[PDB]
């Protein structure tokens, strides 16, 4: 009868009654995790007296108090509810966010898989702040934190005998072009044989043996990135043993989702969605071409973090971000 609606409702309920030990449940497969993070109102917004229209009453529920006018101009609220694996409020720090998003994926690369974590949302929603550090401070961002746990795990008995070497890369995608951020914005070439795997010729891999090393490459890369979006940022952590790639973690700082380059940005985001959904089961773009091998394997996991700016003036941008997020998790 209305089985489709019944399915959507059951999925919402299931997500609403899940325990944190769901995505972080080893011996259990969860290739796709979707979260949302609300940032607090900033100085400028508070000064302009922007109203905060976002509430996160539980760890999986986010509420949008959408301002509306009836035909006769009467003011009311259409309070909409969204459910995610994890919903973070304005008091959540980067370490807390990191703990429930990228942290559970590190093990995946040591188990020989390919993990990806994406920061998605509108311009100024907190994407760069979350992935790269507060602003500036590399150590306080997910790239750093993830690196920190990679060195801790590699020194664990279960992995010691792997004799792995840790490598890092940092590049940005701008208008279908790839630029090495660790090799002075050097423009790189992207090729794809017939067997279809992609290779980024010239991308520089740097050996790191310490978190301080990684922090030096993050500062360097962020210092010469094209703050503001306009590009896709992608910081990678690769594990190698003997000529072979053991595992790889690609952390992506996406461009704002809201000069007709927005066409390339929208195509990449449309492409990203279908690649992630294809993971739990085109019209290609550079981003999805470069990260292709991280969606095709069976031992691959991904996490999507949707950033939201709480201001009333950004309500339409928020709904757009949330609905995109819904469709992504829809494949889990
Ligand atoms: N959780 C947060 N707490 C405090 N400040 C934050 C937080 N998230 C973001 N900000 C700040 O708000 C701005 C948005 O930062 P980021 O620079 O994080 O945005 P995007 O990366 O969201 N923007 P864009 O590059 O235009 O797509 C920066 O000035 C951040 O320092
Ligand atoms: Mg940014």
UniProtKB/Swiss-Prot annotation:
Chain sites annotated for binding ATP: 37, 121-128
Domain Kinesin motor: 31-331
Subcellular location: Cytoplasm, Cytoskeleton; Nucleus; Chromosome, Centromere; Chromosome, Centromere, Kinetochore
Record-listed Phosphoserine modification sites: 268
Source species, domain of life: Eukaryota
Known outcome of mutating residue 70 to A: Loss of microtubule depolymerization activity
PTM annotation, UniProt: Phosphorylation by AURKB, regulates association with centromeres and kinetochores and the microtubule depolymerization activity.
Function: In complex with KIF18B, constitutes the major microtubule plus-end depolymerizing activity in mitotic cells. Regulates the turnover of microtubules at the kinetochore and functions in chromosome segregation during mitosis. Plays a role in chromosome congression and is required for the lateral to end-on conversion of the chromosome-microtubule attachment.
Domain-related comment: The microtubule tip localization signal (MtLS) motif; mediates interaction with MAPRE1 and targeting to the growing microtubule plus ends.
Family named by the database record: Belongs to the TRAFAC class myosin-kinesin ATPase superfamily. Kinesin family. MCAK/KIF2 subfamily.
Record's subunit section: Interacts with CENPH. Interacts with MTUS2/TIP150; the interaction is direct. Interacts with MAPRE1; the interaction is direct, regulated by phosphorylation and is probably required for targeting to growing microtubule plus ends. Interacts with KIF18B at microtubule tips; this interaction increases the affinity of both partners for microtubule plus ends and is required for robust microtubule depolymerization. Phosphorylation by AURKA or AURKB strongly reduces KIF18B-binding.
Descriptive protein name: Kinesin-like protein KIF2C
Organism: Mus musculus
UniProt lineage: Eukaryota, Metazoa, Chordata, Craniata, Vertebrata
